[PDB]
Ligand SMILES: O=c1ccn([C@@H]2O[C@H](COP(=O)(O)OP(=O)(O)O)[C@@H](O)[C@H]2O)c(=O)[nH]1
Ligand SMILES: O=c1ccn([C@@H]2O[C@H](COP(=O)(O)OP(=O)(O)O)[C@@H](O)[C@H]2O)c(=O)[nH]1
Ligand SMILES: Nc1ccn([C@H]2C[C@H](O)[C@@H](COP(=O)(O)O)O2)c(=O)n1
Ligand SMILES: Nc1ccn([C@H]2C[C@H](O)[C@@H](COP(=O)(O)O)O2)c(=O)n1
Ligand SMILES: [Mg+2]
């Protein structure tokens with residue numbers, strides 16, 4: 223019933239920041255953040271699976287990438303049955319979609335030789351199935367790509383904090399950048415969900431600050447949503 | 451609409467063997483085998499995740515145990531919508547249930563220090579969730595425990611073949627045996643599904659051959675089912 227918009231971007235590009243600005247511009251506009259919280263502390267002071275992947279990827283890239291996508295579905299599906307469900311002109315913004323999970327990060331980790339054939343086969347198999355049961359209602363109506371040079375992102379990773387991502391090199395962000403570009407800009411990166419084929423994509427340059435110029439961006443978004 | 455019966459046993463105890471005897475005793479009696487096929491070949495030529503777990507458990511016990519339970523649900527759920535669905539007095543026999551997956555094998559692998567805290571937490575968390583969505587229709591109506599000394603099993607593991615299980619020692623089978631005993635016989639092994647509490651359990655000694663004495667056993671089963 224609700225219009226579902228996904229906010230794609232690189233690491234520390236600024237989805238959270240950008241969405242919070244939209245969040246407070248309507249009571250019929252909710253958000254569904256990546257559960258990065260539970261990734262740094264597993265539960266049911268446990269363990270930090272995010273950090274484990276970073277410290278030794280060739281070992282935890284699979285474990286993580288799986289838990290990560292599961293955790294996201296659980297979260298998106300929930301906010302889907304929330305109070306918002308009964309409003310008039312509702313819109314739900316997702317911080318990333320299960321698509322970038324698999325086609326951007328997971329994929330890139332496999333190409334970076336952190337997941338062997340067997341692991342990467344299982345992952346796709348698992349993912350393919352999961353998004354055929356529940357995923358039937360998480361289909362997107364639109365996508366907003368916050369474009370930003372990997373250098374700008376590497377900077378915002380520092381400005382942010384998280385003592386896990388501090389070891390991340392430009393190379394990694396760069397590889398992840400091209401992945402985004404290929405998928406949302408040049409639209410050459412092929413999926414496995416033939417519907418993304420006809421899905422609208424607003425791209426915004428977010429290399430310059432937000433808390434200031436954020437006026438212009440919003441205008442373009444209101445515009446975009448008005449055509450769905 | 452179908453009565454679901456689970457056939458629990460140790461490794462190579464003889465479920466497959468025993469069920470095939472029942473399978474051919476009614477057209478309203480189908481079977482759902484462990485997809486051990488796809489576990490030895492993930493591509494469907496590819497990698498053998500079963501063997502990987504055996505060669506280096508402290509590394510693949512998690513990956514395997516997860517795929518294994520997923521694969522089972524996918525299979526049980528399917529046969530659940532098969533032609534059998536519209537018969538008169540239908541019965542579907544499961545080779546193992548997701549319960550022994552988690553409380554017998556996975557559990558025991560964690561206690562054997564092959565899954566660290568973080569892995570075992572995620573597994574339970576994952577499993578707890580999975581069996582709350584679909585699992586709602588895979589609830590058992592009865593269970594049949596094929597009891598057999600671990601030694602007898604170790605023997606049948608040899609008689610069978612599988613060049614993966616040939617490295618298995620008695621200790622392993624023994625540990626797995628007590629697990630079974632504690633859960634289905636002494637019923638002291640506590641779960642997390644408060645309904646198994648009131649579920650019927652027929653135990654049969656299968657230490658002596660089947661292709662012969664298999665008459666007696668069947669009698670006791672027809673008997674058991676008649677009271678459900
Ligand atoms: O114009 C901007 C936009 C964002 N940020 C920084 O971006 C960080 C947040 O990055 P974010 O968490 O939003 O990346 P995301 O989680 O949205 O993907 C904040 O600490 C801000 O300091 C900034 O400095 N200037
Ligand atoms: O009375 C019997 C029943 C079974 N088997 C052996 O049990 C093996 C099969 O073990 P099974 O695969 O049935 O264990 P399961 O897969 O049912 O758990 C076969 O090769 C048989 O040779 C046997 O020797 N005598
Ligand atoms: N599918 C995903 C999602 C997140 N992350 C990790 C990578 C970064 O360390 C952090 C990024 O969080 P965010 O995307 O909000 O910047 O989480 C990941 O590896 N794979
Ligand atoms: N939950 C499960 C099911 C099977 N197996 C593995 C262990 C044995 O090598 C083989 C046993 O198959 P079966 O139980 O049909 O004898 O598969 C396992 O480790 N855990
Ligand atoms: Mg965030």
Ligand SMILES: [Mg+2]
Nearest residue numbers: 466483484486
């Ligand atoms: Mg078998």
